Ligand binder design. Structure first.
Ligand code: 5WI
Ligand code: AKG
Ligand code: FE2
Length: 280
């Protein structure tokens, strides 16, 4: 019922697991734990996740309930009530400094850098040539990707599942969870992800799976869900995707030594299709 995940930490040369077999298990499973740097403050983000849905009466973050997608010219952004228990506030990096509270934008920038370092370590381990990283990652091997800082609240009063079974769209997801509910389907059995408030949960998205499908050890996008919540639950995540601007899409690529990078689809196209798959 409970999954046992490999634990890593960011070191001087990148991702440090206990050994090479632990990294090989972690990358093949598509999910692992990443120790949270002692200097990285998560307390403002935790409070934002507990508050964003409550409206302007609740300070300092309740007012973000009133910011819908029309405010951003991007239908994916802002407050969203989902068909599951989940309600969300999603915002891409181009809007953080202007729209998010100053300390929330700061959290997003720091998570972008941690995710940047995690991704470059992964691309090296997958055997992708370094000179192809920028195009292969749609900019995420540097800081030119699309990055969403997304806050999640599970309304326990709503029936049925917390968040439907799915895979993330992008390359790297850095997930901050302090309560039970997350479940992963490694192999073919659903398993609870253990709670560890000292670690992020890291997993790969669909773009990573597509990118590394022909590699020596292909990396998969883990299927995961949030079980029905009988009490309220909150969380937040940092998502790294190939640059998917409404007018500036970087596309999704498969790497093959015999051919280089072959375009598969567009980045926003993958996101819109996935959101349609996730919520039936
Ligand atoms: C790349 C932009 C998207 C919106 C980003 N990637 C995801 O896979 C996503 C999935 C859900 C389950 O959280 C949305 O319901 N969340 C995000 O923030
Ligand atoms: O809330 C969680 O623990 C998981 C949320 C999630 O998987 C997502 O928002 O994509
Ligand atoms: Fe997810």
């Amino acid at each position: 019922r409970t999954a046992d995940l490999e634990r890593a930490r960011l070191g001087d040369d990148g991702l440090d697991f206990q050994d090479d077999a632990a990294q090989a298990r972690a990358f093949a499973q598509g999910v692992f734990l990443l120790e949270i740097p002692e200097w990285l403050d998560l307390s403002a983000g935790d409070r934002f996740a507990r508050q964003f849905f409550q409206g302007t009466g609740v300070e300092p973050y309740g007012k973000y309930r009133d910011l819908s997608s029309e405010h951003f010219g991007d239908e994916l952004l802002g407050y969203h009530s989902r068909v599951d228990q989940l309600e969300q506030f999603l915002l891409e990096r181009r809007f953080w400094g202007e729209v998010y509270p100053s300390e929330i934008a700061t959290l997003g920038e720091h998570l972008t850098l941690l995710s940047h370092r995690v991704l470059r370590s992964v691309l090296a381990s997958a055997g992708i040539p370094e000179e192809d990283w920028h195009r292969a990652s749609g900019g995420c091997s540097e800081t030119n990707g699309s990055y969403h800082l997304t806050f999640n609240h599970y309304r326990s009063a709503h029936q049925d599942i917390g968040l439907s079974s799915h895979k993330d769209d992008g390359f790297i997801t850095v997930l901050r969870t302090t309560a039970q509910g997350l479940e992963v389907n490694r192999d073919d059995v659903w398993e609870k992800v253990p709670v560890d408030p000292a670690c992020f949960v890291v997993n790969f998205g669909l773009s990573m799976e597509i990118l590394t499908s022909a590699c020596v050890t292909p990396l998969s996008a883990i299927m995961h869900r949030v079980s029905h919540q009988n009490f309220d639950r909150s969380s937040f995540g940092h998502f790294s995707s190939s640059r998917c601007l409404p007018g500036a899409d970087d596309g999704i690529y498969r790497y093959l030594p015999s051919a280089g990078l072959e375009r598969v689809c567009g980045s926003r196209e993958l996101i819109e299709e996935n959101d349609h798959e996730i919520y039936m």
